[PDB]
Amino acid sequence: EMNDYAQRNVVPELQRIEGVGQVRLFGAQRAMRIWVDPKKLQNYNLSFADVGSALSAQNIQISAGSIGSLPAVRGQTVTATVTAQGQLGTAEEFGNVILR
Amino acid sequence: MAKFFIDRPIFAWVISIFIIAAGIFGIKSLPVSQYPSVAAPTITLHAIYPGASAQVMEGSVLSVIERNMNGVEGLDYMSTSADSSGSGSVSLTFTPDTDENLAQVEVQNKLSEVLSTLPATVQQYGVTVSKARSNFLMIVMLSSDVQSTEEMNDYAQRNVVPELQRIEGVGQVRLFGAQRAMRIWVDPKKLQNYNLSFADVGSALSAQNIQISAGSIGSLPAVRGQTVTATVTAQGQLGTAEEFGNVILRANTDGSNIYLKDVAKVGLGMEDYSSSTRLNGVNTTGMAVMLSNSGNAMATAKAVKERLAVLEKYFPQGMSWKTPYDTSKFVEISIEKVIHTLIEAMVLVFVVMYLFLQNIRYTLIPTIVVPISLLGGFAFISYMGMSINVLTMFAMILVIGIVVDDAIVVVENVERIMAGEGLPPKEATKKAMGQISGAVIGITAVLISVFVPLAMFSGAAGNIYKQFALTMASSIAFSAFLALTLTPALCATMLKTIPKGHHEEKKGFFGWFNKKFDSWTHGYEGRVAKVLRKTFRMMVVYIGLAVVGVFLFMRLPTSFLPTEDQGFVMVSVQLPAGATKERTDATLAQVTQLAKSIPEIENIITVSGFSFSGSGQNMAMGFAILKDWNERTASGSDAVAVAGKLTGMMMGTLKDGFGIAVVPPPILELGNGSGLSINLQDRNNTGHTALLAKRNELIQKMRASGLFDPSTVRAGGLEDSPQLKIDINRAAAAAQGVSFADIRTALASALSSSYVSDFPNQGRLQRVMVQADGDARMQPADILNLTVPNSSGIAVPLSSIATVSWQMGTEQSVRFNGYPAMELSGSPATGVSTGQAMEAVQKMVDELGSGYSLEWGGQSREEAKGGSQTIALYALAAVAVFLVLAALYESWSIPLAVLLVMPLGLAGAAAGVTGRNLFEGLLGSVPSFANDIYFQVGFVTVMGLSAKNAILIIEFAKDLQAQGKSAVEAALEAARLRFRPIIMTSFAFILGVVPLYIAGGASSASQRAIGTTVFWGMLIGTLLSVFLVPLFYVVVRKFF
Amino acid sequence: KMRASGLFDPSTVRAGGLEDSPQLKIDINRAAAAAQGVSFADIRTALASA
Amino acid sequence: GASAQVMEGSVLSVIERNMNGVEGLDYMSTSADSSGSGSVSLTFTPDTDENLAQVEVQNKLSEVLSTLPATVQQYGVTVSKARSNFLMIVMLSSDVQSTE
Amino acid sequence: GYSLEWGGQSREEAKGGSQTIALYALAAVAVFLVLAALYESWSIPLAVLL
């Protein structure tokens, strides 16, 4: 938690000083680590490439667009931007990633 | 020097010739513009990503770009801005004294490795690295009334743009509009009828529309016996819409394959259809000709107009160029004003010298001395790498009296010695030079010591003051060197020997003028002798005048540059959220019909879909450009009255939306009128509603419990908008045959556009874009779900899985220094400085919880610094002038006698601007005079000239005491000897600034602000100095 | 007209550019490609891998 | 896969027409053969350092990198501020092996 | 419409055509100004320019 708070609030604030060239944080920031048991992949006949394809296909930003764009017909009045989340940000959501 | 240059007139004449030649070579090698390099290096990116909201674009590109733009040498601050259009801008502002090219290539080298983790959509359009600091020369408009916007844009890009940026002087031409592209208007009903989609259409557009590299017959590893080598050309790329209409999508087993002309609509169009430009109601393109550094602006505009006439000789039926706004005409009127005041100053100096010195051979001396000093000042301008602009010419206007004053006071002493002693002009000029050589050396050193700390500030005001300092100090030094060398030769060779008794025994008009001037001098000497007895009452009334001058100076408002008329008024139309382009165009047509009913407005430029306060489908802007200054010579003809009448007509006629009409200020980098901006940042990254609640709490605390003019304080960003968010249920998709990439591809193909490949269109290469059908995407009902991963699979639409419902979401995202922020606006309403308002808003943001900070941006960063740059430098300049006077007079107390004319100019200038404000407040508009840059430099010039007069009086009084005279007697003879040249240079300066007092037209506000300041300062300073300087000498001689 | 004039000696005044050579030109007929059943990816790969 | 017409018209033309505005530049000379290899030669004024000109060329080049085709953005535009004449020709000779 | 341009040494040789008379006039007026400064006469340096 302190290494994640240092990378987001302490490191980019003190590296804008005239003279500072490198800020080497002894540690690492936050990431989502998935520890896979290889003995369970032999039972369900799965591989790491299937997990990678399921993580690349189900976790992506969905940029839909807008309703009533600028090349419109004569008569359009209401314009509303469509926003789709379509993304994962918690561990209990990442636990339900569909493989097969 | 003075004894050496009198017996050798050619030795000074050739030095004057060298200074003339250096000034000519400097004038012929100076850049011409209107405003100098005031700005800091600023880098703008302008990334493109169509079909996205503000938060998605922010979390996609802005957080990845801004997290790696740290460590660059000289970075001051950074900000990112995004909206719902699809274009985000990252403004990186650097520190001064930093090279902008190295900073720009450092941002480019950082973006070269930032771009590797960017998505594939922003890599096709590319993220450029540009600079915000750019010049501005001309605007070229093209109206045809028979063609469209895209055809005129293509004609300008093919025949006008490559011919305008090839001449000398033009730096960069930027078009205002989208280029041509191949739009494929695809109907999804034919796709779901023929069981197609958009992915196969994009794959076909990437597959058939492609370039082939076939190689060459007879390569280098050849066989024994080959003689002929030939290359193979295989052109398999489409370039016609009829060729694009026959793109095979899927071939059947029997025949009749699916084309692109039966399930879609292929045709030429624009790229985004966002921005439009109109001039008086017709279709009009846009070109912003930007000047380059070290170039000319007067000849460049004439060359652009000649090239436009050559192109108009080959224009088609309808098209005609028209330039509504030009900045090159801003500088020819200034040079014309400089030449006009120079000619008028020569005329008045000739008139005064013919009235006083009663001859014509004396008048030839300053008319040679002054232009060589002007050329030496121009040579010192060109040596330091400066340029010619409005501030340089205003400083050359303000230095006119200073370079004639040393020419007058030398020849006055020469004529006085020749009339008194009857000597030949050689010995008389030698005696006058031995009298006043050290005096003019001390005057020159005092003027240099005054004008040096003006060029020592930091910021925009320092960049403004540096031009005035480096012009006026150089002109003073060159005029002093000319008065030391060349002027004794002109008084020695050109002058005639005065006749004893017969000269100064006039008959005619003058003898009466000589008798009246002698009676006035006797009355002035009697008044001085009456003043020189009661020293205590005169001292306490001088102390009272000094403290009331400090009191009148302290109660003045502050400014940097006052606003002035430029010839155009900027208007902005802001419709409510959820508005299309048809209501925006109707309101802009109403704005045009309102602006056509005003006789002051000449043209009107109308821009739809783009504004300075955020771009969108409802924002719009306009520029109402007025007529010339000759036909607008009235009371209600300035841009402020036109803006007020336009606001009053917009509030009464424009029903849909609201539109404000404000005058454009001076230089944007100097935000005079921004007040106090607050960027309320968040550190813990809570959300958007908590930051909005905190911004509302700050607004309510600054309105009800504040003094920040509560009628005008508001959020200076953009309000929220209703949206059409969805919630894709993964549990319903996992229990059915619904994947996740198919919904993404369906939404990105329906509600947004796609860029697949390029195609050649008459030499150049343009884009090919698929936008499906426009009519289908009108209602919020979206039913397109498909793609079961084993078949076509039409099972259920996006009704139970999507759960479409309306929401309220923001349409703008602004981040400051990595953290998101909200833009505010303050105002120092009623006589309150910003130094306590900053502490008040600091306490208001400190009394909240931990995790909410602030950051002053724009103009408030220079006012955030302490006040140790004006008072300390002024005290150092004053003590350095004191030490120069102690070196001159060989004493310590008499420099304190000279230093008592310094509050007199401040008191006179403050009383003059207060009288002008109270005179214009009862008979006109709001007083627009304050403690700006022009008032300060006028106070500096009247301080220098009053100090010069005081040094001359003190040097004339000090040498008369060594011959067995007292203090009051030497002061009386010094006043009697110096009554004439002081009133001579005062009459010359006042008659020179009389046209500067009532000047009207282009840039007339700055001319009035310098003119009334130097007028009242010179008047009150002379009328107090000629009665107080012998009193100061007397009360110092006895006091010590 | 620059040669054989007395000021410029012959056999040394030539052009400084590469002269034009006869090249091979391929015109793809998409109508026969649609009627016979060959896509554009096959001819492109053949011409780029030959 | 380009001739001498579209290569100098789509790649070298925009670079030549947008390279104007740089101070010191006296003349330009672009050349493109039939093998698809362009060469823009920018000649400056004498008495002027290459340190500022070499970064102003890269500043005026990166603005037109987005309107360039996607093929020339992968190979990039190489900047070589070298002379054209030859100083020395080092010849290596051996009678025991081939020249490769 | 058919205009010519030079290259390399020819550009410098074409640029150094009008420099000679201007250089001679500048050297002559420099000698004139220096000898008028030193010997304090206008008639002295006119006999040196001959």
Residue numbers in the entry:
A (entry chain A): 151 to 250
B (entry chain B): 1 to 1040
C (entry chain C): 701 to 750
D (entry chain C): 51 to 150
E (entry chain C): 851 to 900
Authors' account:
The cryo-EM structure of MtrDCR103 revealed that this multidrug efflux pump adopts the overall fold of hydrophobe-amphiphile efflux (HAE)-RND-type proteins and forms a homotrimer. Each protomer contains 12 transmembrane helices (TM1 to TM12) and a large periplasmic domain, which can be divided into six subdomains (PN1, PN2, PC1, PC2, DN, and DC).
Interestingly, the cryo-EM structure of MtrDCR103 indicates that this multidrug efflux pump forms an asymmetric trimer of which the three protomers are distinct and display different conformational states. Like the structure of asymmetric AcrB, the conformations of the three MtrDCR103 protomers can be classified as the “access,” “binding,” and “extrusion” forms. Unexpectedly, an extra density was found within the distal drug-binding site of the binding protomer of MtrDCR103, indicating that our structure of MtrDCR103 is bound by a fortuitous ligand. The shape of this extra density is compatible with a hydrolyzed, decarboxylated ampicillin (Amp) antibiotic with its four-member β-lactam ring open. Within 4.5 Å of this bound deactivated Amp, there are five hydrophobic residues, including F136, I139, F176, V607, and F610, which provide hydrophobic interaction at this distal site to stabilize substrate binding. Interestingly, a positively charged residue R174 is found within the vicinity of this Amp binding site. The cryo-EM structure of the MtrDCR103-Amp complex indicates that at least 17 phosphatidylethanolamine (PE) lipids are anchored within the transmembrane domain.
